[PDB]
Design a protein around this ligand. Structure first.
Ligand code: I48
Lengths: 247, 25
């Protein structure tokens, strides 16, 4: 996270970190959307151009953490995947369209004060909260700048940018299954996700029911916190109908 | 879901939560 702050303990109960079993290595962020289902970005598992094609036997999950390094005994919960699901129409050889993947835990995790699911958006919520100007929250243990690994979970609130601006800022073909967020050149503030933040959640709090909803998944970005450049997020609500896999 | 045990359930607002609501206005 670029221009972030250390999060308070228990800020993001749904935060999940995708790990490489051997050698231990942090690969991505992810979110706990149920006691047995973790949501992440497909590019965290499959992206041929970089030689990525992770199998269940290569991955591992660590939930309830705060420190990037320290193994927090009894707060933290390590688990292994059962099956990985990557969207059938995930376009990796073009614009990363449908950058979404579901990870099914082998054994149901035990919720606690540090482990709790996030809500998925519904029509009403998506309609009321998805508006340019409205700020959302991104969290992760990724680089603090273009590589800086944070010792503690970072957090940053970023505003939703209007589509015309998102499209104009890049050459990549933006689809409706993705949106961008970040401060504009004149907005006088900075911040953005970065390497290691991919897969992490972008959440918004609903004043209607006091509940946090995941509106997007940290997807691609051309650099970290670059002027005129915005970070892209997988549009969760538009892909909720696929999220079919769970049933 | 979305109700954090150490925050929403404790009726405690997190440090930056204010920014989000302000942006809605
Ligand atoms: C797999 C992947 C490809 C690209 N390269 S890219 O030129 O931006 C790109 C864009 C879309 C399709 C293909 C390549 C970049 C990636 O982003 C990983 C970090 N995500 C970020 C999100 C927001 N800010 C900074 C980084 C991950």
């Amino acid at each position: 996270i670029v221009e972030g702050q250390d999060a308070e303990v228990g800020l993001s109960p749904w935060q999940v970190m995708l790990f490489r079993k051997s050698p231990q290595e942090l690969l991505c962020g992810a979110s706990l959307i149920s006691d047995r289902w973790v949501l992440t970005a497909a590019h965290c598992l499959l992206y041929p151009p970089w030689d990525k094609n992770f199998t269940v036997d290569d991955l591992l999950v660590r939930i309830g953490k705060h420190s990037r390094t320290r193994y927090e005994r009894k707060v933290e919960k390590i688990s292994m995947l059962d099956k990985i699901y990557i969207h059938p129409r995930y376009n990796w050889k073009e614009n990363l369209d449908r950058d979404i993947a579901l990870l099914k835990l082998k054994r149901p995790i035990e919720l606690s004060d540090y482990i709790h699911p996030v809500c998925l958006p519904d029509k009403q919520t998506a309609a009321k909260l998805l508006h340019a100007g409205f700020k959302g929250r991104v969290t992760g243990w990724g680089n603090r700048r273009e590589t800086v690994q944070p010792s503690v979970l970072q957090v940053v609130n970023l505003p939703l940018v209007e589509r015309p601006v998102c499209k104009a800022s890049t050459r990549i073909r933006i689809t409706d299954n993705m949106f961008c967020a970040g401060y504009k050149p004149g907005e006088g503030k900075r911040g953005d996700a970065c390497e290691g933040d991919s897969g992490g959640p972008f959440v918004m709090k609903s004043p209607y029911n006091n509940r946090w909803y995941q509106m997007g998944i940290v997807s691609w970005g051309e650099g970290c916190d670059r002027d005129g450049k915005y970070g892209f997020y997988t549009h969760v609500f538009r892909l909720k109908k696929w999220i079919k896999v769970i049933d | 879901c979305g109700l954090r045990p150490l925050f929403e359930k404790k009726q405690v607002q997190d440090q930056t939560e204010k920014e989000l609501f302000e942006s809605y206005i």
